[PDB]
């Protein structure tokens, strides 16, 4: 056919031509053969889309390969390319675009990716806490699409064990002060953080939490693949268990795998009952393909389990499954591999993990605190309430046997009348329930911080 592609530089175009020549040498077509046309990245947004549509569907293409230039934009070519290529329902192939928005196959009608998206890495988090005796997380999250998608995926995957996340704190993107959320998360009992945001936000939260003594002993972190790169690897505290990918910025192997898959799919599809040719011209025909959905369906179910990057197996929504992450620790500003992920399993290596702090142990994920703030109300015969005098105490009474009663300092409001705001005067409360609480606290060895309720209703 006339398969085209869009690449970054001329050398990669030469590599693509060599790969297609090798593929044709391995298996030669009957009469139609296989051509190969390529273009370059011209950044103008609109000009890019016009040029690609003209130069590609003017040549009656069958599938387009689009790659990600090294410009830190994270959207670049795929967004203009995919809309035009999906108007006619021709299928496109992604190479190094890991963003999680293209996984929603409702805006982007036709899109296939070779590398797993960011959100899928969240699955590894679960396996991280499978064999480590960890079941309490306070995971943070951003507010863009990727953060919400990752949080939703983790929540829907954590229901198999009938467990539940503790807190789901989120911060607005591109902020400048995140001390409130960190202060709120400090006063808790879980010691596992699954922070996942953008690089600048990661640096901001690292700097904010450094001053809060959050990087001390027994505070195990867990950090995605974006928060250790380029900039955030400067402020991050020691001991973070960041992840990575093996076959990342390696265009040659990905191109070889993609051309192999495309050639196998086209050879499978060429024998069929009804087949139609692609439209000619950027303008003119406005009718969608009658075979496009069939092409996508036959391309997705392609177990091309022979290549150079391992077995290639897609999934229901058009991603790549069964990847191989390389768990990587940060010891004294020198990233070192300390494990391997091979698919639904983890294999520890012959290296001792150094946790934040510098202890060589298995820090516990729970703390008992033992503060036990307690609410109560003034009924009448159970919990008496009497105002206190300006002496730091309430009173000193006795009983028939002369045994003094037991009192505690009571933090309640004084706004019984409507409209007036609460004064929060530290009054005094004592009685049956207070004595029972005293005995219970003495028996179980803990502490109480009794305080009344605001509204005053039984609930």
């Amino acid at each position, epitope marked *: 056919v006339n398969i085209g592609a869009v690449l970054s530089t001329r050398k990669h175009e030469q590599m693509f031509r060599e790969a297609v020549n090798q593929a044709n040498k391995r298996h030669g077509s009957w009469k139609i053969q296989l051509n190969a046309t390529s273009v370059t990245h011209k950044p103008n947004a609109i000009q890019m889309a016009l040029s690609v549509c003209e130069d590609l569907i003017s040549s009656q293409v069958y599938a387009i390969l689009v790659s990600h230039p090294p410009t830190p934009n994270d959207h670049f070519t795929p967004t203009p390319v995919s809309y035009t290529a999906g108007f006619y329902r021709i299928p496109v192939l992604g190479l190094t675009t890991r963003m999680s928005i293209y996984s929603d196959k409702s805006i982007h009608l036709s899109f296939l990716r070779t590398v797993p998206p960011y959100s899928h890495q969240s699955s590894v988090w679960f396996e991280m806490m499978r064999v480590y005796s960890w079941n309490h997380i306070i995971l943070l999250v951003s507010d863009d699409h990727e953060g919400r998608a990752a949080q939703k995926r983790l929540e829907t995957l954590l229901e198999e064990r009938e467990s539940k996340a503790e807190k789901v704190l989120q911060f607005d993107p591109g902020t400048k002060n995140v001390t409130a959320l960190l202060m709120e998360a400090k006063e808790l009992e879980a010691r596992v953080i699954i922070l996942s945001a953008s690089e600048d936000d990661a640096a901001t939260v690292y700097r904010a939490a*450094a001053m809060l003594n959050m990087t001390g002993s027994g505070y195990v972190w867990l950090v995605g693949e974006r928060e250790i790169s*380029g*900039n955030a*690897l*400067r*402020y991050a*505290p*020691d001991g973070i268990l960041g992840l990575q990918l093996i076959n990342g910025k390696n265009e040659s192997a990905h191109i070889s795998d993609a051309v192999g898959v495309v050639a196998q799919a086209v050879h499978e599809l060429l024998e069929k009952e009804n087949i139609t040719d692609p439209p000619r011209g950027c303008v003119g025909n406005t009718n969608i393909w009658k075979t496009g959905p069939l092409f996508k369906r036959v391309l997705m179910s392609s177990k091309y389990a022979d290549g150079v990057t391992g077995r290639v197996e897609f999934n229901e929504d058009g991603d790549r499954k069964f990847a191989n992450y390389s768990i990587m620790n940060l*010891q*004294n*500003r*020198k*990233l*070192v591999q300390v494990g391997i992920y091979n698919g639904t399993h983890v294999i520890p290596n012959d*290296r*001792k993990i*150094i946790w934040p*702090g*510098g202890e*060589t142990e298995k820090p516990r994920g729970y703390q008992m605190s033992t503060r036990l703030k307690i609410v109560t109300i003034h009924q009448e015969p159970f919990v008496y309430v009497k105002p206190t005098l300006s002496d730091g105490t309430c009173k000193e009474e006795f009983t028939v046997n002369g045994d003094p009663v037991k009192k505690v300092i009571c933090t309640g409001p004084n706004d019984t009348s409507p409209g007036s705001p609460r004064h929060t005067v530290p009054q005094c409360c004592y009685g049956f329930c207070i004595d029972l609480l005293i005995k219970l606290a003495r028996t179980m060895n803990f502490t109480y911080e009794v305080h009344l309720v605001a509204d005053g209703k039984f609930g």
Partner: antibody
Amino acid sequence: LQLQESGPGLVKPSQTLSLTCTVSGGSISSSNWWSWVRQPPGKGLEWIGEIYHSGNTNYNPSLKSRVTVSVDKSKNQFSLKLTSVTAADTAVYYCARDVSGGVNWFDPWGQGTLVTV
Amino acid sequence: NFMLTQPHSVSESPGKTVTISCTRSSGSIASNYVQWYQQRPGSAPTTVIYEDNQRPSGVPDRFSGSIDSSSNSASLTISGLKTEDEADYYCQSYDSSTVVFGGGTKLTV
């Protein structure tokens, strides 16, 4: 917290040379590291490797297959096991401590030796 | 891996203002800040400045570091030249793989 290097002048060629270093006034049971910056004469510097107080090392990737560094708390000292010394090893070897913190910054250095072959 | 350039030396009359600069070949000096080391002749090197913003206790405030963040060239100020500061000055940095040092520089007064 003063460091002193043991091997006075062992300069035997085509052998294994093992300088040893000890620390006075400080205990290795801490959250620090120890490095062996090598100083060629008349040129710049070249970092060699570091060893944590308990279990793991970090060498330079260039000469990553010829240097093994070990520590022992009982005698409170660390030393290397450099093998296959060549004519390019005529450099004075140092013994310097760093501070983990959040920076790679070396503490007060050692006296240094005169091991040149 | 990269390399930091201090070509060979510097020299000026007493009371002048001149200092060498550290140039980084690959990447940019924005993440891994550099440090300046002082090496008196016939003695082990000793630190003179770190992070270009914090100073060791007791060292005179004559030295002051800065980061250009424009052409990957960290700069130093040793204004107030005089005799006793005759020594060698070194520039050291690190990255995700190793830690590297500069070439070398001696000042003449």
